[PDB]
Amino acid sequence: FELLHAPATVCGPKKSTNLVKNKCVNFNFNGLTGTGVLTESNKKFLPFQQFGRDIADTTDAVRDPQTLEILDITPCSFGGVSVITPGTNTSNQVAVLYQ
Amino acid sequence: NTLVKQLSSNFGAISSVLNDILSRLDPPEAEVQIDRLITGRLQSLQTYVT
């Protein structure tokens, strides 16, 4: 072999896995990494576009490298948790709240 | 908005992607870049809260 006299152009194809959606999962799109749920889209990409953005550090759409499909990314549900208490001075009960 | 945009700066590290640093360097060498990024983001958060 020769040692980096040009951009890399010779190596394996890497194995792709079957596409799954509707449950938020990790993803890798040969340049995009992260976690989220993938849903069907309604926007229309230009033929040479790869992935869309909305604001800085916000990826809202990814093009399928297999079937040229547009998928929307939505983060997994999350939030803080709070406890309602009437005070241990009287009783011991809770009314946990998700936000 | 400014706060979110602050996340797109390298702060003098190799890159602003957290997983990329872990995916291309040894942990004992990546720790310093992680520390730089942590310091920068913490300072930005302090300024916003003030």
Binding site: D54, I55, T58, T74, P75, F78 | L3, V4, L7
Partner: peptide, 30 residues
Amino acid sequence: PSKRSFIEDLLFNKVTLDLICAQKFNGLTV
């Protein structure tokens, strides 16, 4: 259904307010 006076309706219409999803990327909440 939202019982308000006429001038209150004009006030509401004259002030114009996803960003929330962008925050949800980073844990910020409203």
